[PDB]
Amino acid sequence: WARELGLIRKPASFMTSICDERGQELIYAGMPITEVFKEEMGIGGVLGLLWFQKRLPKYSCQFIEMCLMVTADHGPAVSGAHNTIICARAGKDLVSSLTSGLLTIGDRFGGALDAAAKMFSKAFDSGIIPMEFVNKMKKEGKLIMGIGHRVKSINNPDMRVQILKDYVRQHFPATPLLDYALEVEKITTSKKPNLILNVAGLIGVAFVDMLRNCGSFTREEADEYIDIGALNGIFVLGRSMGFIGHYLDQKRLKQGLYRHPWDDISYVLPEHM
Amino acid sequence: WARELGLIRKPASFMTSICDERGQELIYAGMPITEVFKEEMGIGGVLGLLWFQKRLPKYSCQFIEMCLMVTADHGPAVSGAHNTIICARAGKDLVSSLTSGLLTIGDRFGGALDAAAKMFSKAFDSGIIPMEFVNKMKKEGKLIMGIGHRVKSINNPDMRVQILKDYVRQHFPATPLLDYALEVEKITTSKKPNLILNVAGLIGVAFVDMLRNCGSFTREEADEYIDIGALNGIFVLGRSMGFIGHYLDQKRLKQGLYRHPWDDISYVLPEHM
Amino acid sequence: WARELGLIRKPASFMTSICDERGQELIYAGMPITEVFKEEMGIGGVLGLLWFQKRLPKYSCQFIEMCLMVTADHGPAVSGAHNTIICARAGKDLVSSLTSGLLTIGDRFGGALDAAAKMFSKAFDSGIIPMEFVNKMKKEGKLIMGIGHRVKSINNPDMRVQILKDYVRQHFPATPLLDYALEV
Amino acid sequence: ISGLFNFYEDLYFTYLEINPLVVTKDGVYVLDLAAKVDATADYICKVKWGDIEFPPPFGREAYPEEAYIADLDAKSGASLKLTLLNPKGRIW
Amino acid sequence: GKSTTLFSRHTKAIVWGMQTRAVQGMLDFDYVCSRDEPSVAAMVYPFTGDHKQKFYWGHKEILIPVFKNMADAMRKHPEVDVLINFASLRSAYDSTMETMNYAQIRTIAIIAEGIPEALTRKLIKKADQKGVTIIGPATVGGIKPGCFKIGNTGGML
Ligand SMILES: CC(C)(COP(=O)(O)OP(=O)(O)OC[C@H]1O[C@@H](n2cnc3c(N)ncnc32)[C@H](O)[C@@H]1OP(=O)(O)O)[C@@H](O)C(=O)NCCC(=O)NCCS
Ligand SMILES: CC(C)(COP(=O)(O)OP(=O)(O)OC[C@H]1O[C@@H](n2cnc3c(N)ncnc32)[C@H](O)[C@@H]1OP(=O)(O)O)[C@@H](O)C(=O)NCCC(=O)NCCS
């Protein structure tokens, strides 16, 4: 009642700019939910509003949805899916299992999107040509992030790199970083055929291209969103669908508690500590 | 080499049925990724494949996408968004912050979708009429899950209950549980105006209706998917978009470490233990 | 049966050196659990075995236990305790609530122990004297990690810094980095 | 001559004969030259060589399948060689 | 040359240091003086990254930028003509020397007590050369009612 009368001052401890719950209608970054559905944005447009506070063009939202679709799952063998399956077989919980799987997302697993975007953006912005970039990565003892496939090569394309690349070619206004990465890929496949642009490499460079080539962002905003981890969010949100699917799969199959076989563990304990 | 020759037997410790990473093309529940994009399913179709191993009809996938859109965020005041913001302001990590927020999803927060679906399904399958269901919930000391809004009422509709309800009415073949829930809502709004069907109630009953009225599932499969927590997955996947948006928002605003003010905490320690 | 006969080769995918579950008795880094209790190590000795695979001296184990005691809690206002309380009030779970609180542990909250150890070790090993270290931190725009209190000062000591400092002074054989930090 | 040697060893030539080289008070003139270059040095000199071509020895025209095999040889590190003398032979 | 008018209703100042209570007192004084804008345009704190600090303009909430460096603060705020220096005695001399490399600053207030006299004389000589007015060290500052207040001068509202 003192605040209503404006008789006291109390600083707000929190700031927010993405969603307004209070009021008659829910608002996503200045846009009412009814307008969100009338304008026919889907997951991609809602993600643009909630993550970037921008009304992205339709091809940008479609590309974001495609990126979520292609990273949805990559089988049960990877670290995150393995952990989610273990937690589901421990009879645990959907949130607990998905979270157990998601906590593996980082440098070695699931971070290739962010790493590739950063590496290629740094090389492109420094002004060095693709051959200089390849040589510079080589003499630094660093593999190019987003380059290389286990089985697929030139003349045997990834086919989900192909889908995203075709979409980006047909709908994006300009793709400078994608062109740079394709030149780098030409060099690397000249070294050996399977050194192709990855799904991680293509998504990273195409996401940088979308951020800084669609009209919604300035260069500083696009660089900031790459820096604070928007591509980590893309991978996490995409792979959450697969992790939840793995949880539901393990529950449906009624798989019991997992124990790792002792024959697969090498015990190297000290003699007597 | 012994396995290739078929000279030894080793049981596989894991089972999976949702995704096939190995092979020339990625497969989502028996469907190649190129076919997934050619058939123009979006997030909803991929979710149907990965969570239910079904090729859902187009309206089902669209409805799933709508459900993800309306649960994307509900502001920073709720428990999960609050925890995610705290973790982001601790300078922590995207995965860590989102996970900290997601671990609050359960009974009291974010579980009303599942609870409403289960309650209404139990009432509908027991054969009791809506008035009997209302009375039975009343004398059990239980509030109906999915009924009730803070401000919005009859003649002041939720407007995202309205969007989903209009879509379900226009595109679903049959909505028996939704009709049952609407009768229940008529009774409860006769008691007082704001006792309307929630977003949680509408999504829960419409998801049960989609599962058991689209042709993809048998009754046993639909009941099993409700039981093992598919609606928990719907809420978690939808609200992950908002939690990641909140993380990015706090990073962009450069919000420092949060400490809860002492004046908001009541200390009731014992005299001397 | 082929492995028992030694007829096939299959590399082990995991390595471990801290605990041996298989066998008649549980082993903590080469030490049987019965010997762990006979030697009267407590949480500190078990932690030494499991984290460092070492049989630490008794004062080391006691100091580790003391460190665990002094960091046990610091009220409900900090980020981790706040998150744990929020998750508990969401009716959630012990593991879920504790985990929600623990996921805030990092740079800004709970990382000052690691940061201070690293900063002081780097300064001490570089050979610079404490005044040079203070000046170098100042012109780098960096506050010294592990220095500073909200209310307590000289003549008003922390009193749990005092407990640990007294124990370390009385029981440790040598404390060069502690002496360096005291000069700082 | 000095400059020519620098041309020889910068572009990874293995054979380079300019005969005859006619020099008069007006200047030097290269009437003819036969040159063999070290093809494996392409990764060093692709910028300087441009789209350098290596003509086959003067004789029978290369078969489309033989050119296919040569193209295959560049696909990977494997060695893939094929040469014909008389396709009408029975020993293959 | 040293000016005759140091402060006006449009005077903008940069505050060196993390002095949120003093800046809020400054802003409250500006509000009750019916100033159009706050008298503090930016803050400089070398031990943090650039961010925005939340302050009060009457009952409204405003954001004041905090810069790690002098250079960025003066770049983004060329309308600032005053520096209020809350650096301690060990940092005040260097802060003031760095400040007098920006000609936009015409008045510097030094709050710290205990600066050595020789360093103060060097500050005085450079300020005389640059035509910069210095409200000498070991001062609360000064007040121009209706226009501007230095730091904690005049106490609370
Ligand atoms: C406790 C309980 C699980 C014992 O189970 P059990 O079937 O007798 O034995 P386990 O399931 O532990 O192991 C069975 C075999 O697998 C072996 N094994 C255990 N872990 C293994 C691993 N990681 N890799 C390979 N083999 C393993 C065991 O050595 C044992 O070998 P054996 O067949 O030569 O005896 C059972 O009595 C029970 O369910 N009790 C209910 C009470 C309870 O749950 N207590 C909790 C225990 S703290
Ligand atoms: C340690 C360090 C943060 C001290 O900070 P400080 O600004 O002196 O004090 P705090 O940040 O605790 O907060 C200052 C005030 O807020 C108050 N406060 C602390 N927690 C509070 C809460 N939850 N609610 C309300 N007020 C609170 C304090 O009582 C203090 O009151 P005062 O203004 O009357 O003195 C600082 O010296 C530093 O950054 N050191 C670097 C080394 C380091 O980080 N060490 C880690 C500490 S274990």
Side-chain angles (χ1 to χ4, degrees), chain A residues 1-3 5-57 59-130 133-212 214-272, chain B residues 1-3 5-57 59-130 133-212 214-272, chain C residues 1-3 5-57 59-130 133-184, chain D, chain E:
Chain A
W1 172 244
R3 286 291 299 274
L5 296 200
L7 285 168
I8 49 170
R9 237 149 58 137
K10 198 179 178 324
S13 277
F14 287 92
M15 230 184 276
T16 192
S17 39
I18 72 140
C19 175
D20 207 339
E21 49 179 276
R22 61 195 184 169
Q24 285 314 296
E25 189 170 346
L26 177 71
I27 284 147
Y28 282 169
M31 186 156 162
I33 189 77
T34 49
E35 206 211 336
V36 166
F37 281 94
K38 260 167 271 143
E39 290 313 294
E40 280 179 341
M41 50 213 65
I43 306 293
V46 165
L47 189 146
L49 288 170
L50 287 181
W51 293 17
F52 313 117
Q53 285 84 261
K54 297 288 171 32
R55 170 73 180 274
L56 303 180
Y59 69 88
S60 285
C61 310
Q62 198 49 55
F63 169 74
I64 284 173
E65 275 149 38
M66 273 166 81
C67 285
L68 295 171
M69 290 174 68
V70 301
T71 62
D73 208 35
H74 210 249
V78 300
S79 278
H82 189 72
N83 267 24
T84 290
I85 286 155
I86 298 306
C87 199
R89 291 181 57 167
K92 191 58 197 294
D93 203 34
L94 190 142
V95 166
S96 288
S97 307
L98 161 79
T99 282
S100 188
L102 286 178
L103 284 154
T104 61
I105 313 293
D107 38 346
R108 296 179 190 172
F109 170 60
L113 262 74
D114 209 64
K118 288 176 161 125
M119 177 167 317
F120 274 102
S121 297
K122 198 175 107 172
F124 187 75
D125 298 332
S126 63
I128 67 183
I129 65 161
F133 168 55
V134 169
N135 292 333
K136 178 183 182 281
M137 272 325 86
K138 174 187 186 180
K139 64 230 199 213
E140 281 171 25
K142 259 182 279 193
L143 285 192
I144 299 168
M145 288 282 344
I147 285 285
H149 202 283
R150 67 162 219 285
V151 308
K152 294 226 134 211
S153 55
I154 35 176
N155 313 128
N156 187 41
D158 202 308
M159 260 330 311
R160 66 202 220 270
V161 163
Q162 295 307 309
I163 294 164
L164 293 159
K165 192 161 55 177
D166 292 350
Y167 186 86
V168 164
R169 241 69 195 276
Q170 301 163 9
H171 297 84
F172 280 29
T175 66
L177 190 57
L178 172 64
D179 297 342
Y180 188 89
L182 289 172
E183 298 309 293
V184 171
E185 189 215 356
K186 265 198 283 291
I187 293 161
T188 57
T189 51
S190 71
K191 288 179 169 193
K192 65 193 303 201
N194 61 301
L195 288 184
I196 59 168
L197 204 56
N198 283 149
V199 183
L202 183 85
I203 288 181
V205 301
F207 211 90
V208 175
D209 274 333
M210 176 204 72
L211 282 183
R212 66 169 60 166
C214 81
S216 320
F217 308 81
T218 79
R219 165 75 33 113
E220 294 69 49
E221 304 193 87
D223 289 12
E224 186 176 21
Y225 273 120
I226 292 301
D227 179 74
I228 61 179
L231 270 165
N232 290 315
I234 287 294
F235 182 85
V236 165
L237 189 68
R239 190 49 56 90
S240 289
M241 320 174 56
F243 286 178
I244 295 165
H246 278 302
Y247 167 85
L248 298 168
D249 195 36
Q250 300 308 306
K251 292 296 177 180
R252 249 201 101 171
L253 297 164
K254 319 231 200 57
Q255 304 277 103
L257 182 75
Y258 179 77
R259 229 201 183 246
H260 202 63
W262 283 332
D263 77 273
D264 205 50
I265 304 155
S266 167
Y267 286 76
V268 290
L269 274 75
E271 53 180 0
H272 195 277
Chain B
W1 180 233
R3 286 291 299 274
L5 296 200
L7 285 168
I8 49 170
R9 237 149 58 137
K10 198 179 178 324
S13 278
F14 287 92
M15 224 186 282
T16 192
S17 39
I18 72 139
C19 175
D20 207 339
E21 49 179 277
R22 61 195 184 169
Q24 285 314 296
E25 189 170 346
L26 177 71
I27 284 147
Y28 282 170
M31 190 160 155
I33 189 77
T34 49
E35 206 211 336
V36 166
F37 281 94
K38 267 174 262 133
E39 290 313 294
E40 271 167 20
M41 49 210 54
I43 306 293
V46 165
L47 189 146
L49 288 170
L50 287 182
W51 293 17
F52 313 118
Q53 288 81 264
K54 297 288 171 32
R55 169 73 180 274
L56 303 180
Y59 69 88
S60 285
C61 310
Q62 198 49 54
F63 169 74
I64 284 173
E65 275 149 37
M66 302 192 54
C67 285
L68 295 171
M69 297 175 61
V70 301
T71 61
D73 208 35
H74 210 249
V78 300
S79 278
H82 189 72
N83 267 24
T84 290
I85 286 155
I86 298 305
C87 200
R89 291 181 57 167
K92 191 58 197 294
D93 203 34
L94 190 142
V95 166
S96 288
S97 307
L98 161 79
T99 282
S100 188
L102 286 178
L103 284 154
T104 61
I105 313 293
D107 38 346
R108 296 179 190 172
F109 170 60
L113 261 74
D114 209 64
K118 288 177 161 125
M119 186 179 295
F120 274 102
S121 297
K122 198 175 107 172
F124 187 76
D125 298 332
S126 63
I128 67 183
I129 65 162
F133 168 55
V134 169
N135 292 333
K136 178 183 182 280
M137 272 328 87
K138 174 187 186 180
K139 71 231 167 197
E140 281 171 25
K142 259 182 279 193
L143 285 192
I144 299 168
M145 299 285 335
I147 285 284
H149 203 281
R150 67 162 219 285
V151 309
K152 294 226 134 211
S153 55
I154 36 178
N155 318 139
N156 187 41
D158 202 308
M159 260 330 314
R160 66 202 219 270
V161 163
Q162 295 307 309
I163 294 165
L164 293 159
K165 192 161 55 177
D166 292 351
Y167 186 86
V168 164
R169 241 69 195 276
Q170 273 132 51
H171 297 84
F172 280 29
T175 66
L177 190 57
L178 172 64
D179 297 342
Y180 188 89
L182 289 172
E183 298 309 293
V184 170
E185 189 215 356
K186 265 198 283 291
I187 293 161
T188 57
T189 51
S190 71
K191 288 179 169 193
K192 64 193 303 201
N194 61 301
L195 288 184
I196 59 168
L197 204 57
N198 283 149
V199 183
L202 183 85
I203 288 181
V205 301
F207 211 90
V208 175
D209 274 334
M210 179 210 78
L211 282 183
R212 66 169 60 166
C214 82
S216 320
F217 308 81
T218 79
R219 165 75 33 113
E220 294 69 49
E221 304 193 88
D223 289 12
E224 186 176 20
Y225 273 120
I226 292 301
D227 179 74
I228 61 179
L231 270 165
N232 290 315
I234 287 294
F235 182 85
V236 165
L237 189 68
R239 190 48 56 90
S240 289
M241 320 174 51
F243 286 178
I244 295 165
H246 278 302
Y247 167 85
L248 298 168
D249 195 36
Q250 300 308 306
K251 292 296 177 180
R252 249 201 101 171
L253 297 164
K254 319 231 200 57
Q255 304 277 103
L257 182 75
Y258 179 77
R259 229 201 183 246
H260 202 63
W262 283 332
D263 78 273
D264 204 50
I265 304 155
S266 167
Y267 286 76
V268 290
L269 274 75
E271 53 180 0
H272 195 277
Chain C
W1 173 240
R3 286 291 299 274
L5 296 200
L7 285 168
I8 48 170
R9 237 149 58 138
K10 198 179 178 324
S13 277
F14 287 92
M15 230 187 276
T16 192
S17 39
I18 72 139
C19 175
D20 207 339
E21 49 179 276
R22 61 195 184 169
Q24 285 314 296
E25 189 170 346
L26 177 71
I27 284 147
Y28 282 170
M31 185 153 165
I33 189 77
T34 49
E35 206 211 336
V36 166
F37 281 95
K38 260 167 271 143
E39 290 313 294
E40 241 158 74
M41 49 211 54
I43 306 293
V46 165
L47 189 146
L49 288 170
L50 287 181
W51 293 16
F52 313 118
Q53 288 81 264
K54 297 288 171 32
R55 170 73 180 274
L56 303 180
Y59 69 88
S60 285
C61 310
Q62 198 49 55
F63 169 74
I64 284 173
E65 275 149 38
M66 272 168 84
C67 285
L68 295 171
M69 296 175 62
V70 301
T71 62
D73 208 35
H74 210 249
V78 300
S79 278
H82 189 72
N83 267 24
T84 290
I85 286 155
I86 298 306
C87 200
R89 291 181 57 167
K92 191 58 197 294
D93 203 34
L94 190 142
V95 166
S96 288
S97 307
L98 161 79
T99 283
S100 188
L102 286 178
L103 284 154
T104 61
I105 313 293
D107 38 347
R108 296 179 190 172
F109 170 60
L113 261 74
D114 209 64
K118 288 177 161 126
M119 186 179 295
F120 274 102
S121 297
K122 198 175 107 172
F124 187 75
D125 298 332
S126 63
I128 67 183
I129 65 161
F133 168 55
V134 169
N135 292 333
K136 178 183 182 280
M137 272 327 86
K138 174 187 186 180
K139 68 230 181 203
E140 280 171 25
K142 259 182 278 193
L143 285 192
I144 299 168
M145 293 285 339
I147 285 286
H149 202 283
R150 67 162 219 285
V151 306
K152 294 226 134 211
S153 55
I154 35 175
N155 320 129
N156 187 41
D158 202 308
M159 263 330 314
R160 66 202 219 270
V161 163
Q162 295 307 309
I163 294 165
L164 293 159
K165 192 161 55 177
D166 292 350
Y167 186 86
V168 164
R169 241 69 195 276
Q170 303 164 7
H171 297 84
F172 280 29
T175 66
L177 190 57
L178 172 64
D179 297 342
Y180 188 89
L182 289 172
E183 298 309 293
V184 170
Chain D
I1 292 316
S2 179
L4 185 66
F5 194 73
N6 283 76
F7 172 65
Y8 172 87
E9 87 171 355
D10 277 312
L11 276 76
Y12 281 75
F13 279 83
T14 79
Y15 184 44
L16 168 94
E17 64 145 329
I18 41 150
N19 151 63
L21 164 88
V22 279
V23 50
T24 322
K25 275 74 67 178
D26 55 358
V28 295
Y29 301 83
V30 186
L31 300 202
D32 193 340
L33 68 80
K36 284 188 263 253
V37 80
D38 189 14
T40 61
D42 68 9
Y43 80 99
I44 310 173
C45 310
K46 68 195 324 274
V47 152
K48 259 202 200 51
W49 292 357
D51 267 10
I52 182 159
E53 283 322 82
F54 310 106
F58 163 79
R60 158 218 92 224
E61 323 276 285
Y63 289 63
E65 283 156 314
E66 185 171 343
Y68 185 49
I69 295 317
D71 210 315
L72 270 170
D73 225 353
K75 299 288 100 152
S76 308
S79 290
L80 256 299
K81 323 299 216 206
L82 191 270
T83 279
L84 305 182
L85 267 60
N86 45 262
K88 313 299 223 84
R90 57 177 317 231
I91 313 299
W92 277 86
Chain E
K2 287 155 186 282
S3 65
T4 303
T5 293
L6 309 176
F7 319 111
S8 68
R9 316 190 85 253
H10 321 280
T11 283
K12 287 287 201 168
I14 284 174
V15 170
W16 200 103
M18 206 33 57
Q19 300 271 328
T20 78
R21 291 137 325 290
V23 168
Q24 186 62 81
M26 275 191 86
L27 297 205
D28 288 339
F29 174 87
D30 302 330
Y31 187 79
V32 302
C33 286
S34 297
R35 274 187 54 135
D36 292 344
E37 288 172 283
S39 48
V40 177
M43 278 171 96
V44 171
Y45 187 51
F47 296 97
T48 194
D50 298 4
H51 61 285
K52 272 139 183 36
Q53 177 122 15
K54 198 185 284 183
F55 278 102
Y56 264 122
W57 188 237
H59 64 96
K60 213 181 74 84
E61 210 84 37
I62 64 177
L63 293 174
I64 295 190
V66 188
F67 298 90
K68 178 184 282 287
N69 303 299
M70 215 144 260
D72 308 35
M74 311 258 189
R75 273 196 308 103
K76 311 232 217 294
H77 304 274
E79 81 279 352
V80 166
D81 50 304
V82 170
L83 181 91
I84 308 185
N85 200 10
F86 281 98
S88 81
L89 61 95
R90 302 160 291 271
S91 296
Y93 174 79
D94 315 79
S95 316
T96 312
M97 293 300 159
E98 177 187 11
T99 307
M100 307 210 239
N101 299 338
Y102 305 87
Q104 64 181 100
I105 301 297
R106 316 305 313 150
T107 303
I108 307 181
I110 311 171
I111 315 296
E113 173 140 14
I115 309 185
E117 308 173 4
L119 265 47
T120 297
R121 286 184 326 180
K122 295 189 194 83
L123 294 170
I124 283 163
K125 172 186 181 175
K126 183 166 176 189
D128 293 15
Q129 284 167 354
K130 301 273 200 169
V132 171
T133 294
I134 284 184
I135 314 300
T139 196
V140 69
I143 190 153
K144 206 194 181 187
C147 312
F148 191 78
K149 192 172 85 77
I150 295 168
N152 298 299
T153 310
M156 283 154 42
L157 196 59

